[PDB]
Design a protein around this ligand. Structure first.
Ligand SMILES: [K+]
Ligand SMILES: [K+]
Ligand SMILES: [K+]
Ligand SMILES: [K+]
Lengths: 259, 257, 249
């Protein structure tokens, strides 16, 4: 069993993948719980940011290989899905930061690719090696990965299943930052608390949803430009648009109301 | 109020955001002037490249925070895209010589250019969400197409500052240089295009590159447009002159089309 | 009258195609393009071929089109339309269509010393072989616009830093590195796993599939693979601590 732990404090929810005996291996039940937690936390107005992390020393070692030799495609309803976490982090209004504190392999990595922002441990092993086991990348990696690193880096990681370093993840655009493992979660939390304190709630929600809706649906430039205008009318019609500059000029923290 | 200055010499037009008392702050009226200049310079056959830059020591500090209260105290034609046409809609190449600080819309408008050279000493940020508004001037569309979704999400959702070096490392900028060298490097690049790149070749290439991004053209549609553009170009004078001039090691004498 | 020749060698699951034209630094012609497209199709269809490596007769990869004093896509099918992985071992100079055809490969390994450029606009023509589409999907729109609108030379190091290339190495090491990568795929990656992964990655780019459509195909491809012997063999080999033996190989 890998459990999902949850703690909410001062506007930041931390979800921890907790399976010490298996380096937090992914399971079907863990995927069900993670999707349910994403939805509930997204809906909770008190939650400004979600941080996803693993019980040290790993983030998520992915599918249990020794336990996956006879996972036949049995006919059933509901059927199997290659997207075992729904909703995906990129479907939420709430920003999601993956504090990848150690090894992230297979679906451990492809689920981390759903987050807006990734901070990776320098000491971690990272790979998407599904094709070396006779299956294929999952959880939308065929779509998320080229949108980070371009098609060549994506093809190399998906077609060879090769391991890559935290440093190469930053160099190629997969990850935002790399740090020693013991510093990763703290950096993610500092970033999360800065969003919770200093970024307006509706500003974050509309910006995240336009960024990702445009990717998900293939919006044209004209369609994105029109939605920025419509989102601006929504934001400028709320007092938070006056509070941001007022608080800055006063030298005080903003008192966000949201809408 | 920041003015727009314009100088055209030897096929290169330089537009300067000139507001020395405010780090070249942006206003809607400046945006209107910039869009109008883009359109006129695009239509001017003598202009091969447009370079956009700021009066030192800044590129453009964006919307003044100090001016926000007056704005929200007071338009049916409001747009989050206050510069139209965008640089990426033109036939004419646009280089942003980002000679210093570029903040907010100062940065998002710079993202419209084909090429960015950034000052190593500059402060760069898109901090709109920290002020209760959101990224503007198509940043939700231009930025992931430069740096990928993760760097884009970090810059847009946190509003954090970033260095010129990080801009180059991630794909936002083409080059970084000390501030006082940025404009000169942009001008050398602009004059190389004006001298050595055929006018219709630049126009068709820029428009296919950007039209395909703007409208999500399929690979098949892009391939068909390349074929059409080639048939247009191969039957023109400049397709003969380019190789002829190269074989002589002389500057080409372009006619355009 | 000699031409750039297309040579082919298949050994241990890896096909090497060589652009062999040392008299012209392996220049490209429409006829070479026809031969390359035909070889890509045949090798894709050959079950014995796990990976195709494209390379040039030293010291060049491909000097591009001849200059003098119909389709802009002269290689069909393109490498990215195949089921079979394609690695371009860009062992030297790749200019013009020499570079834009290299951009069709899944993976590029570039010689550190080589000159690279897409200089068509400097010759009164324009980028070709889908460079307007492949290039921004590697390096972003700014690096793409710079390379296409200036036509200027760029380095292998810059190619790796921007995402155009996967690795850069001294010229004399490039083919060896591509072959080691190819043989690792042939040995350690299941055939249908590579085919479906390649086709979904590229089809989604070619036709602008929505995220929902990509997710649905991942599920359908997983159902296909879970119904295949290689999905049993991968875990079984791992548990045994032995190399996998893929079906029909
Ligand atoms: K929430
Ligand atoms: K013009
Ligand atoms: K084959
Ligand atoms: K990069």
């Amino acid at each position: 069993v890998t459990e999902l732990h949850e703690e909410i404090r001062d506007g930041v929810a931390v979800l921890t993948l907790h399976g010490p005996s298996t380096r937090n291996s992914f399971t079907v039940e863990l995927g069900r719980q993670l999707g349910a937690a994403y939805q509930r936390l997204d809906d909770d107005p008190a939650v400004r940011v979600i941080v996803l992390t693993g019980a040290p020393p790993a983030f998520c070692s992915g599918a249990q290989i020794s336990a996956a030799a006879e996972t036949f495609a049995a006919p059933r309803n509901p059927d199997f899905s290659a997207s075992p976490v729904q909703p995906a982090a990129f479907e939420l209004r709430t920003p999601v930061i993956a504090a990848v504190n150690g090894h992230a392999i297979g679906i451990g990595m492809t689920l981390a690719l759903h987050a807006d922002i990734r901070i990776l441990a320098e000491e971690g092993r990272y790979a998407i090696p599904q094709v070396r086991f006779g299956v294929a990348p999952d959880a939308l990696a065929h779509w998320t990965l080229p949108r980070l690193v371009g098609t060549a880096v994506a093809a190399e990681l998906l077609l060879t299943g090769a391991s890559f370093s935290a440093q190469r993840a930053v160099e190629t655009g997969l990850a935002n930052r790399c740090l020693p493992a013991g510093k990763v979660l703290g950096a993610a939390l500092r970033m999360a608390h800065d969003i919770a304190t200093n970024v307006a709630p509706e500003s974050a929600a509309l910006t995240k949803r336009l960024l990702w809706d445009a990717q998900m649906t293939g919006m044209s430039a004209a369609e994105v430009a029109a939605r920025e205008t419509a989102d601006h009318l929504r934001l400028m019609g709320s007092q938070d648009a006056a509070e941001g500059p007022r608080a800055f000029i006063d030298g005080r923290p903003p008192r966000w109301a949201g809408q």
